[PDB]
Amino acid sequence: KLLEFAKSPEVFDWMVKIRRKIHENPELGYEELETSKLIRSELELIGIKYRYPVAITGVIGYIGTGEPPFVALRADMDALPIQEGVEWEHKSKIAGKMHACGHDGHVTMLLGAAKILHEHRHHLQGTVVLIFQPAEEGLSGAKKMREEGALKNVEAIFGIHLSARIPFGKAASRAGSFLAGAGVFEAVITGKTIDPVVAASSIVLSLQQLVSRETDPLDSKVVTVSKVNPDSITIGGTLRAFTGFTQLQQRVKEVITKQAAVHRCNASVNLTPNGREPMPPTVNNKDLYKQFKKVVRDLLGQEAFVEAAPVMGSEDFSYFAETIPGHFSLLGMQDETNGYASSHSPLYRINEDVLPYGAAIHASMAVQYLKEKAS
Numbered sequence: 001k002l003l004e005f006a007k008s009p010e011v012f013d014w015m016v017k018i019r020r021k022i023h024e025n026p027e028l029g030y031e032e033l034e035t036s037k038l039i040r041s042e043l044e045l046i047g048i049k050y051r052y053p054v055a056i057t058g059v060i061g062y063i064g065t066g067e068p069p070f071v072a073l074r075a076d077m078d079a080l081p082i083q084e085g086v087e088w089e090h091k092s093k094i095a096g097k098m099h100a101c102g103h104d105g106h107v108t109m110l111l112g113a114a115k116i117l118h119e120h121r122h123h124l125q126g127t128v129v130l131i132f133q134p135a136e137e138g139l140s141g142a143k144k145m146r147e148e149g150a151l152k153n154v155e156a157i158f159g160i161h162l163s164a165r166i167p168f169g170k171a172a173s174r175a176g177s178f179l180a181g182a183g184v185f186e187a188v189i190t191g192k193t194i195d196p197v198v199a200a201s202s203i204v205l206s207l208q209q210l211v212s213r214e215t216d217p218l219d220s221k222v223v224t225v226s227k228v229n230p231d232s233i234t235i236g237g238t239l240r241a242f243t244g245f246t247q248l249q250q251r252v253k254e255v256i257t258k259q260a261a262v263h264r265c266n267a268s269v270n271l272t273p274n275g276r277e278p279m280p281p282t283v284n285n286k287d288l289y290k291q292f293k294k295v296v297r298d299l300l301g302q303e304a305f306v307e308a309a310p311v312m313g314s315e316d317f318s319y320f321a322e323t324i325p326g327h328f329s330l331l332g333m334q335d336e337t338n339g340y341a342s343s344h345s346p347l348y349r350i351n352e353d354v355l356p357y358g359a360a361i362h363a364s365m366a367v368q369y370l371k372e373k374a375s
Contacts, residue, residue, distance in 0.1 A: 035078075
């Protein structure tokens with residue numbers, strides 16, 4: 001019922017205040033200096049110790065006993081090089097950049113949560129870890145924080161992402177496979193005269209075939225050939241799946257290889273070209289999802305819980321929920337007539353009145369988890 005606190009003029013105004021400053025000054029991946037300085041100042045003001053730097057601009061705060069169990073809450077920090085088309089007082093003052101992906105609401109609701117949780121810190125049966133992650137858009141920030149030990153000793157992490165595809169004030173998630181993974185591959189087709197070209201256009205159609213839709217949105221698999229360019233032809237492609245990703249990677253390789261061989265050609269295929277490691281699908285741990293549904297129902301209502309549909313989007317949170325139990329949820333903003341623009345657009349819009357919902361959900365989820373682990 002801490003939503004009442006989260007909605008307080010003092011707290012809500014403070015949250016809306018910080019959200020706007022970040023919104024007016026969008027910073028790109030790994031260059032979120034000002035966003036990072038603000039987060040650190042608010043943690044300082046609230047009364048929360050933190051580790052900095054992590055992944056250049058990242059910050060990790062602590063609330064509780066200081067001892068295990070450790071549970072983490074995560075928010076992204078970076079904007080995108082998009083010109084804000086929304087005309088308003090708090091529009092980005094940085095031309096060509098915009099927080100058109102809600103992250104502003106994310107850092108915001110994470111500082112909210114930090115502020116609130118601190119209010120009840122001596123009651124926490126463990127330590128809530130607050131992760132302020134840089135460069136989510138380029139899908140390399142979560143992995144970099146992991147490399148730097150951000151996940152050590154931590155046993156369960158929760159993340160929230162505002163959504164224009166979910167009704168306002170409803171949190172949406174599902175158990176297990178939720179967000180699609182993504183990988184790339186590179187192939188070089190060289191003649192062991194025109195065969196290489198014959199082989200290349202063949203392989204292309206043959207890989208484009210693999211893409212398909214079925215009756216379960218979790219079975220969707222796609223392979224996109226984007227690069228192709230005669231002694232040798234380089235073919236750069238991508239692949240995505242919610243399940244059986246490894247089996248799809250091998251299929252892409254097998255096809256290119258055999259389709260090259262029957263055309264008397266050499267086949268060079270790389271599934272991690274230039275250090276582009278695959279990003280596995282985002283999997284929501286059943287226990288966290290099961291616990292999460294309760295937190296949402298107890299807080300908002302028996303009807304707020306929105307069972308999410310598998311999505312083929314991009315969210316590097318998966319590098320966390322694969323290494324430790326993870327739970328990723330959406331937070332609704334959409335109104336009755338769909339006036340709220342979809343994420344990734346010059347017109348994107350968070351309804352600023354959603355901040356207390358995620359702040360409470362963030363705060364609450366960390367408490368119930370700990371107050372459950374100790375049961």
